[PDB]
Structures are given as structure tokens and as C-alpha cells.
Design a protein around this nucleic acid. Structure first.
Ligand code: K
Ligand code: K
Ligand code: K
Ligand code: K
Ligand code: K
Ligand code: K
Ligand code: MG
Ligand code: MG
Ligand code: MG
Ligand code: MG
Ligand code: MG
Ligand code: MG
Ligand code: MG
Ligand code: MG
Ligand code: MG
Lengths: 240, 128, 225, 63, 109, 125, 53
RNA sequence: CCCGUCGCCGCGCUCUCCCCCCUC
RNA sequence: CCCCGCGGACGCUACGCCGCGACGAGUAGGAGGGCCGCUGCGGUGAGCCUUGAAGCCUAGGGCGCGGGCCCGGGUGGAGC
């Protein structure tokens, strides 16, 4: 086995390489790389044990079903596309770059102005409105429900902790194990608790973003106010 | 809880309202049962706008979901336990229902047997 | 014999694979040759007229031999002679286009149905986009979309036409087998012209949409498919 | 709207015997398969004659 | 702490003079009086918020009398800033001349 | 002959049920209980039927022997299988496939045996 | 099949075979033909009818 | 034999060996 | 020369099932289909029914393009 090489056919447009068939034949040296010519044990034997009980038993793994439904569903045709969500490409608007001030449009933080840190692996944006400034923690948000303003701060050379991933921010639940019939309420735990790890991470990011916010004048006051529509102005006439 | 059908496609109904007979609203003697208007000057037959619509084959339901109950099953009328076992191998596509004339004592046995054979009954609690 | 039959099946599959591979290479090179031919005629007309002007003379181009005819009126109240000619042009529906080879016999037919059609001289791009986007073949009396080259080759291979490029070449440069290639094409079912029509009831030269518009049929085609 | 006539769309021809003779229906099944699964035009002619009415199947004298 | 939605008016259904297509509605957005300014609002979620008699469940809140029929702006209508909207259910005719909110949610800016 | 007898009873039979746009057949040895030439339990030289046991446990696999086709008293051989579900299905599979006794009814008989056994196990609360 | 005529046992009044056999009469190999049977039955049931007016 | 990631079409790498630039 | 697996969905009321393409105005009139409907007769449903038939009523649940039909509740009292 040889070491895998790079593509050697740079893509100039999606689906088209820069070099032709003959050009790639020579780049690959296909003239000298010409070739002419040259499992899973379903059953396992095991010592059963016992006098005159036979030597062993040919035990087959994955036994046959012991019940069949009255009818089944035919299998699907093949689709040659339709990748799972974890393999989708993640697209981010050109107006959203790290350090950009965003405006939240939905949720309990409606209309607040927050700072954009990174896009996460699922395409969700990681935002912090410095929790001291507007009570928005390190939180995920969707780029389709934010407004990217033109005001930006340089958050380069700041360290967003590595464990701040989608699995970190994914919600957790209790109900309803060991309990089927609902007569005693399982409404306990509903008070979601801020993990001490979350407080540590919030303190770490803010300690190095807040100083850069304080650098230029009255940005903390800007982050501290909320966005609203006044009867004079209209969103299509506004420059963000 | 209830027995589920093999597949539950989305049932699309082209029309959800009945085709009422022309002028059945103006007369008691004329019932809502559809009758094709054949008068020489009838504006419903001529299909003038804003009039009572006429049934035609274009309103036909999809053959995949025709005669399908809202529960995704199709119904087979049964009169005794013996007719119930024809649905043993059609459990997940066809549901039984008991005829109106069946006695209270006898439909108890039908419901009991259908629970055993995993056949769904549309009227399991019907005389009690 | 299991090994012998397995080898026999591999030999046949390889031979079939080499046959497509040779057929694909032929299709590739013929399209390359057509591209060379297409610019040769385009440059020749420029050069021909360019040298007449040097001499102070006039180069009169050959009269176009290909026309795209679009029916622009409906099927209500049509006189029998106009009705018959539209059927002979395979224009039984409004906004049905078809390719017509131009000669004395066909032109006089186009003059009969003058108020009912808009026609002109399609260029190379119009032929390509009509065939590729809306090209349907009449295969066993069925309207079949030209999704594979095998559909063209099965019905027209005896005439040398085996791919979409060959079909486009025969239609554009009216070849020997134009009648077979043109009739193989189902009449084109075009959408309503996006952006409207100036006036369907009068001739093009009087502000309307009917009659012969020489090269302006290409503007109509873009808005129409 | 399209400009065609619909009075000749439905071709009038026997697609099966109007008889209920179960023995005739059995050998119609046999020759329906033979006509489909062979290239013999003889089977096609025999199959369509099996659909035909009695007046279209006149008796053949020995002479 | 703010309006956060644009004020719009349900002017009527898409229609000819003598035929009315109730599945789509024509909305007049405040401040948008030309067709070239409707680009911002295309695809934006629109809501017809009203009140009824019986309480209904409120997402993230106690049940109240507020109901809503959701929709979105589909395209521009005419040359003067009207937009066409599709709602999950055809808008009731009692809402003509009343408030429709345009959410700004699916932001492209 | 099966094909000739089918042409007689395809639409005229005492076992025929035609209701609710559906058709069913109630002859003793009809797997799936449908009106069809393949599944008819009377017209074929060899047939297989699966029925619940006389008591409330096990299945009865009845096959049709080849000798006395005009002698209905001794024309069917009935065997009773009263073991676990997986072993019961294997026996029915071997009876049909290994004997090459109507292999086109293999899954129908296996599915019917599963339905019978599934109906015999007690219901839950 | 059609030319083959089996032997049928004659059963005794006690219900078991008596040892006597009769070859199957050829009438039992005649064509089975319900459309004729239905036709003949349809027109012969009309023959015992009693007039009404 | 755990659910055909399959056909046509367009490509990439390996069964050749060297280097170059980042990264462990 | 299948065998560490002895195994491998559905189907084909052939009057059935499946695929592809085009098409769909209609008086007078013609034809086809009707698991539309009424009454009675021959068969058949080891059919239903005083533990409630027919009929009738119903802001009850549904099915069918439709003719119509099934089921729940009430009334009724001997058949269907
Ligand atoms: K009609
Ligand atoms: K004729
Ligand atoms: K309010
Ligand atoms: K009867
Ligand atoms: K109906
Ligand atoms: K009653
Ligand atoms: Mg309906
Ligand atoms: Mg009335
Ligand atoms: Mg009149
Ligand atoms: Mg006119
Ligand atoms: Mg436009
Ligand atoms: Mg005129
Ligand atoms: Mg039409
Ligand atoms: Mg007509
Ligand atoms: Mg018609």
C-alpha cells in the first residue's frame, strides 16, 4: 500500500477539474502504472460439557426470528443523495464574522445585542453577550434568526475553549425513567441548574472579550440596550 | 394503545363536503341525494360560476388511500366469530366491525376473539 | 463448469464495457468536430461579407433554410384551410413550436397560416436550448423525454444520428435526414412568453406578433422556453 | 386546448371472448401466453380468432 | 421592550375583478411604497394575531385568548410596494384592513 | 384439474365472501384466506394448511397427500406441533422447503403459524 | 386423465368397503360446463310456474 | 444472510518513486 | 460438484397485477360499467335476531366522484 496523494487535479469549478483526461493521465504517470492480473464465522463451536452430552455444540450466532408479522413493507429505492444532517455542509453568511455584534430576533433574549464567537459543527452560532452587560450567557443561536450588524470587534487571539461544542450545549432531561403511570408528579428538577463548569467557561471567555469591548467608546452601553422598531424607521431603510 | 396499521400515509381528500342536489335547499320534497340536472336551461348543468358543483371523476380519491379510515385501516363488516378469522392475516391493513343487528351477548365474544387475534374493532364497546 | 460460465459472463461484460467506451469516445469526438464546423460557418459568413466591403461590393448571405414556427393563436374559429396546414405543421396547440425546413413548398404553406403563427430563423443557441430543455422523441408513438443517448440511437441510428449532438447538427445544418430527425422530435410544448406579447392579432411588421420575424424569433424563444 | 378528434380514439375490437365457456377461456389463457412469449405470428392470429364470434368462425367442410 | 415587527395591512386577496383567490393575500407594508423596496421582506414570516373567546395554549406561557395564523411573504405585487403572502390557513375576511405583523425572523442580512 | 376447477369456483362458491370492496375465502386450507388460484385450499393436488390446535396451544399442520384425491376422508394428514415458536417455524419451513411441497406457500404458512402462536400466548394487563 | 377411468369401491351399509368395485362411468369425465348448466336451469325453472294476472 | 451506500454518467487515490509547505 | 449458516420479503381474485404515453366541453341521441337502489324465486352464508328483526328519529363516527352504504345512540316489538 502506497501513501495517499493529494488530488493532483485542482478544482476550478465544482464538478470540473482544471486538467483534462490526457493531462491527468500524464500527471498520474498512468503510462507506467499498468496492471495486468494478480470471513465472518456465523457459527462457533463451544464445549457444552457433561458426560455423554456430546463433545461440543455448533452454536450459530444471529438466530432466526421466532415471530413474523402478518405483512411487511417493501424496501425503498436507492436515492444517491440525501446525506444525514451531520454530513451536511455548513453555510455562514458573509456578514457574520468572529467579533461581529448580532441582534437576537427570537427567544427570551429577544432584541438583545450579542457578540459572535464561532460557528459550531452543526452550523449554530456560538454567541456571548458579555453576561455582565446584557445577561446573555455563552449560548447557541441560529444565523437565520439574527441580524448581523456592521459593528465588529477584533476577537482574534482570544481562546474559545475547545470543549465548547454542540454536545456541550445540548439540552439534558430527566423524565421519565422507572415510572410509567403518572400519578405522583415528576416535575422535580425542572429548575435547570447552571453547572459550575458553565460558570467557569463564561468567566474565561468574558475576561478576554470584555476588555476589548471597553477599548472603543460606549460599546458596552450599546450592548447593554436592546433593539426595537420605532414608528418612524423601517427595517428595509436601515443600515445595520 | 390502539393497534396501529402497517402504514399510515397522509390521506388527501379532494373534496370534504357532500354534493347536494340542486334546489334541495328550497324544497323538503327534494332530498340532498345527488341527481344530475337535465333541464334545458339549468344553470347548474351548464356549469355557471358560483353555482352548485357537479360530481365528476376528477374528484376521485387516490387509489392508495381509497376507503381508508382516518386511522389508516379499512373496514370489513363481520356478523359472527367465524367471519372474524378471515382478517387474521390482514391484521395490519383491515379492521373488523360488528354488524348493527348482532346481539349484545354475541358481540362480546367477537370483541374478545378480536383482541386475541390482534384485529382492530371500530365499535368494540357498542352494547354495554 | 461454474468457473467456465463465470469467466464466460465476465468476458461478455468486459466486451459490453469496451463497446460503450468506444461508443462514448465516438460521441465525444463527433461533438468536438461539430464545434469546429460550427465556428467555421460562423467565421466564414463574417469573412465573406468582410471581403465584399473591401471591394466596395455586397455579400448577400444564403437564404435561411431552417425556420422555427410557433403557433400563437388558439383552436377556436379556425378556417378549414388554415386548420389543415397547422395539422400538417404539427401545430395542434397554442405555443407549440416546431422546426420547418424552408423551400418553396413549405414557405407557401407558412403564408397560408400567417395570422396564426410566429416564425423566424433560429440560431445555434436556440436549437441547443430547444432540444436540450424541451426535446422529446416520438418513440413507438409515445412522447419520451430525451434523457439518454440510447433513445436517439435506437430510432435514428440507421441514419447515422446517435446522440443529441447529431440530432442538433441535423436540425441546424439541414442535412440529408432532416425529415426523419425532425419528425422524430415531438412538437415543442413551450410556455407562455414571459414578458407578454406585443399584439398577437396583427403582423410583426405592423407592431404585432404574427408572421415572419427573421432573427427576432430567437428573442421570442428565450422568453418562451 | 388541442385540435384533435376523439371519435376514433377507442378501437372497436375483441380483447377477449364474449363467451363464458370455461374450456375456451382456458385455451385462451394458453394462447395468450404463447402469443406474448413467442415471436410466432401464428399464435397471434389463432389467439384473436379465439375471441371471435360464431359468425366470424364459420364451419369448415371436410371437402 | 420593542415592536420588533413591521406593521402591515391585509388589503385583500389576490383577485381579478370578478374572481377571488383566497389562498393568497395581498399585504401593504408600512413605509414600503415601491416594488424595488420589497426585496427585504421576501420570505419574511408574517403573522395575523387576533383574540378569541376561549383560552388556547401559548408556547412558553400560560394559556390566554390570543390566537395566530402564521404565514410568509412570497413575492411582490404590483409596482407600489404590495406583497403577496401565503398563510397556513386562508385569512378570514374579517381581517381586511387590520394588522399583519412581519417578523423579520428569516433574516438574510 | 386445478385450473378447470378454479374457473368453476372463482366467483361461485359457498366459501366466497365479497364485502366492502374486499374478497375473502373461508375454505379450510386457505392460507391468508384470500380468493385466489394460488391459495385456494380445495382445487390443488397438494395443499398445506395451518390451524390452531384443538386445545389452546400449538399448531396443526395439515398437508394433502397425493394418492386419494377423490377420497376426502383420508386425503389430509394432520400433524400437531407444540414446541417453542422458533422450533415450530423451523418444522413448518422444513416440511415445505425440504419436501419441495408447494414452496410458494412457505412464507404464508410461516406467517400464519406466527399469528396463531402469537394469539395463543396470554394477553397482558 | 379424460380417458382414464378409475375403479370405485362399493361401500356396505355398515360404511366400510365391501370389496366390490365399479369402473367410473364415462359420464363423470364429461365436460363440466356451468354456463350451459346455468342456462338449462334458468329456462327449466320457468316451466313449473303458475300464471298470474 | 444486519438495511441492495446500486445502474448510467463525471471524477480522486492506491497497488511507482521522489521531493516541497504547514501540522503531530 | 453452494454449504461455518440449510436460509432468503411481496406477488399471479390471469375477469388478476404492473409499466409507459396521450387525452378529458356537451343538448337531442347512442353505448358501457355500477361491491347503486326496490320487490319476489332457486342456491348459499352450520348467516343475524326477544341478550331485541323491520320501520322510524338523531348537533353521533365514517366511507364512496356519485348513485348510496356501514357503524354509535334512541324509539320499536318479530322478523331480516
Ligand atoms: K362529464
Ligand atoms: K372501423
Ligand atoms: K395583546
Ligand atoms: K338467501
Ligand atoms: K358509494
Ligand atoms: K333499531
Ligand atoms: Mg365525501
Ligand atoms: Mg330538501
Ligand atoms: Mg336552452
Ligand atoms: Mg375568436
Ligand atoms: Mg412578471
Ligand atoms: Mg379575429
Ligand atoms: Mg384538456
Ligand atoms: Mg367529444
Ligand atoms: Mg365528457
Amino acid at each position: 500500500k502506497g501513501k495517499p496523494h493529494c488530488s493532483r487535479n485542482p478544482v476550478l469549478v465544482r464538478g470540473i477539474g482544471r486538467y483534462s483526461r490526457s493531462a491527468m493521465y500524464s500527471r498520474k504517470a498512468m503510462y507506467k502504472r499498468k496492471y495486468s492480473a494478480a470471513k465472518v464465522l456465523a457459527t462457533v463451536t463451544k464445549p457444552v460439557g457433561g458426560d455423554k452430552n456430546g463433545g461440543t455444540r455448533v452454536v450459530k450466532l444471529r438466530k432466526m426470528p421466532r415471530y413474523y408479522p402478518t405483512e411487511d413493507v417493501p424496501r425503498k429505492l436507492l436515492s444517491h443523495g440525501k446525506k444525514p444532517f451531520s454530513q451536511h455542509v455548513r453555510k455562514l453568511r458573509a456578514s457574520i464574522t468572529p467579533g461581529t455584534i448580532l441582534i437576537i430576533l427570537t427567544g427570551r433574549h429577544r432584541g438583545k445585542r450579542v457578540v459572535f464567537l464561532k460557528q459550531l459543527a452543526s452550523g449554530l452560532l456560538l454567541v456571548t453577550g458579555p453576561l455582565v452587560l446584557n445577561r446573555v450567557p455563552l449560548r447557541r443561536t441560529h444565523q437565520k434568526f439574527v441580524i448581523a450588524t456592521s459593528t465588529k470587534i477584533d476577537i482574534s487571539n482570544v481562546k474559545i475553549p475547545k470543549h465548547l461544542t454542540d454536545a456541550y450545549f445540548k439540552k439534558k432531561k430527566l423524565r421519565k425513567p422507572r415510572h410509567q403511570e403518572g400519578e405522583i408528579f415528576d416535575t422535580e428538577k425542572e429548575k435547570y441548574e447552571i453547572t459550575e463548569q458553565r460558570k467557569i467557561d463564561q468567566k474565561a471567555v468574558d475576561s478576554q472579550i470584555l476588555p476589548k469591548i471597553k477599548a472603543i467608546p460606549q460599546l458596552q452601553g450599546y450592548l447593554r440596550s436592546v433593539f426595537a422598531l420605532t414608528n418612524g424607521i423601517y427595517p428595509h431603510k436601515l443600515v445595520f | 394503545a390502539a393497534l396501529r396499521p402497517l402504514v399510515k400515509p397522509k390521506i388527501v381528500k379532494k373534496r370534504t363536503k357532500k354534493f347536494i342536489r340542486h334546489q334541495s335547499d328550497r324544497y323538503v320534497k327534494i332530498k340532498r341525494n345527488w341527481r344530475k340536472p337535465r333541464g334545458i336551461d339549468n344553470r347548474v348543468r351548464r356549469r355557471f360560476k358560483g353555482q352548485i358543483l357537479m360530481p365528476n371523476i376528477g374528484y376521485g380519491s387516490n387509489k392508495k388511500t381509497k376507503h381508508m379510515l382516518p386511522s389508516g385501516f379499512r373496514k370489513f363488516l363481520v356478523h359472527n366469530v367465524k367471519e372474524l378469522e378471515v382478517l387474521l392475516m390482514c391484521n395490519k391493513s383491515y379492521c373488523a366491525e360488528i354488524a348493527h343487528n348482532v346481539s349484545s351477548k354475541n358481540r362480546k365474544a367477537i370483541v374478545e376473539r378480536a383482541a386475541q387475534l390482534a384485529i382492530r374493532v371500530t365499535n368494540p364497546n357498542a352494547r354495554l | 463448469n461454474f468457473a467456465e460460465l463465470k469467466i464466460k459472463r465476465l468476458r461478455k461484460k468486459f466486451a459490453q464495457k469496451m463497446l460503450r467506451k468506444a461508443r462514448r469516445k465516438l460521441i465525444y469526438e463527433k461533438a468536438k468536430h461539430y464545434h469546429k464546423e460550427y465556428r467555421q460557418m460562423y467565421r466564414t459568413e463574417i469573412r465573406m461579407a468582410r471581403m465584399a466591403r473591401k471591394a466596395g461590393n455586397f455579400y448577400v448571405p444564403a437564404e435561411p433554410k431552417l425556420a422555427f414556427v410557433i403557433r400563437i393563436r388558439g383552436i377556436n374559429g379556425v378556417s378549414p384551410k388554415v386548420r389543415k396546414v397547422l395539422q400538417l405543421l404539427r401545430l395542434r396547440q397554442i405555443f407549440n413550436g416546431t422546426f420547418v425546413k424552408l423551400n418553396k413548398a413549405s414557405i407557401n404553406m407558412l403564408r397560408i397560416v400567417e395570422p396564426y403563427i410566429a416564425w423566424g430563423y433560429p440560431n445555434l443557441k436556440s436549437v441547443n436550448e430547444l432540444i436540450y430543455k424541451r426535446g422529446y422523441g416520438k418513440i413507438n408513438k409515445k412522447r419520451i423525454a430525451l434523457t439518454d443517448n440510447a433513445l436517439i440511437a435506437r430510432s435514428l441510428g440507421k441514419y447515422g444520428i446517435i446522440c443529441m449532438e447529431d440530432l442538433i447538427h441535423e436540425i441546424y445544418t439541414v442535412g440529408k435526414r432532416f425529415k426523419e430527425a425532425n419528425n422524430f422530435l415531438w412538437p415543442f410544448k413551450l410556455s407562455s412568453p414571459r414578458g407578454g406579447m406585443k399584439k398577437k392579432t396583427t403582423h410583426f411588421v405592423e407592431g404585432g406578433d404574427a408572421g415572419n420575424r427573421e432573427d427576432q424569433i430567437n428573442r421570442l424563444i428565450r422568453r418562451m422556453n | 386546448g388541442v385540435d384533435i378528434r376523439h371519435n376514433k380514439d377507442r378501437k372497436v375490437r375483441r380483447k377477449e371472448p364474449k363467451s363464458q365457456d370455461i374450456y375456451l377461456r382456458l385455451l385462451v389463457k394458453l394462447y395468450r401466453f404463447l402469443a406474448r412469449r413467442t415471436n410466432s405470428t401464428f399464435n397471434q392470429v389463432v389467439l384473436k380468432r379465439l375471441f371471435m364470434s360464431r359468425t366470424n368462425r364459420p364451419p369448415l367442410s371436410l371437402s | 421592550s420593542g415592536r420588533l415587527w413591521s406593521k402591515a395591512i391585509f388589503a385583500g386577496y389576490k383577485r381579478g375583478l370578478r374572481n377571488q383567490r383566497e389562498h393568497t393575500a395581498l399585504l401593504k407594508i408600512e413605509g414600503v411604497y415601491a416594488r424595488d423596496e420589497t426585496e427585504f421582506y421576501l420570505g419574511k414570516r408574517c403573522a395575523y394575531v387576533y383574540k378569541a373567546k376561549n383560552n388556547t395554549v401559548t408556547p412558553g406561557g400560560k394559556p390566554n385568548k390570543t390566537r395566530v395564523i402564521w404565514g410568509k411573504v412570497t413575492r411582490a405585487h404590483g409596482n407600489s410596494g404590495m406583497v403577496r403572502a401565503k398563510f397556513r390557513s386562508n385569512l378570514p375576511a374579517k381581517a381586511i384592513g387590520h394588522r399583519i405583523r412581519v417578523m423579520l425572523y428569516p433574516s438574510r442580512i | 384439474s386445478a385450473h378447470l376447477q378454479w374457473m368453476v369456483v372463482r366467483n361461485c362458491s359457498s366459501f366466497l365472501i365479497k364485502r366492502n370492496k374486499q374478497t375473502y375465502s373461508t375454505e379450510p386450507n386457505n392460507l391468508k384466506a384470500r380468493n385466489s388460484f394460488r391459495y385456494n385450499g380445495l382445487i390443488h393436488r397438494k395443499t398445506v394448511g395451518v390451524e390452531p390446535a384443538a386445545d389452546g396451544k400449538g399448531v396443526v399442520v395439515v398437508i394433502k397427500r397425493r394418492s386419494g384425491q377423490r377420497k376426502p376422508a383420508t386425503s389430509y394428514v394432520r400433524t400437531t406441533i407444540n414446541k417453542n415458536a422458533r422450533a415450530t417455524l423451523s418444522s413448518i419451513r422444513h416440511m415445505i422447503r425440504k419436501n419441495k411441497y408447494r414452496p410458494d406457500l412457505r412464507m404464508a404458512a410461516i406467517r400464519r403459524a406466527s399469528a396463531i402462536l402469537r394469539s395463543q400466548k396470554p394477553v397482558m394487563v | 386423465m379424460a380417458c382414464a377411468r378409475p375403479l370405485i369401491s362399493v361401500y356396505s351399509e355398515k360404511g366400510e368397503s365391501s370389496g366390490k368395485n365399479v369402473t367410473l362411468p364415462a359420464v363423470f369425465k364429461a365436460p363440466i360446463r356451468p354456463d350451459i348448466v346455468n342456462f338449462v336451469h334458468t329456462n327449466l325453472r320457468k316451466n313449473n310456474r303458475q300464471p298470474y294476472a
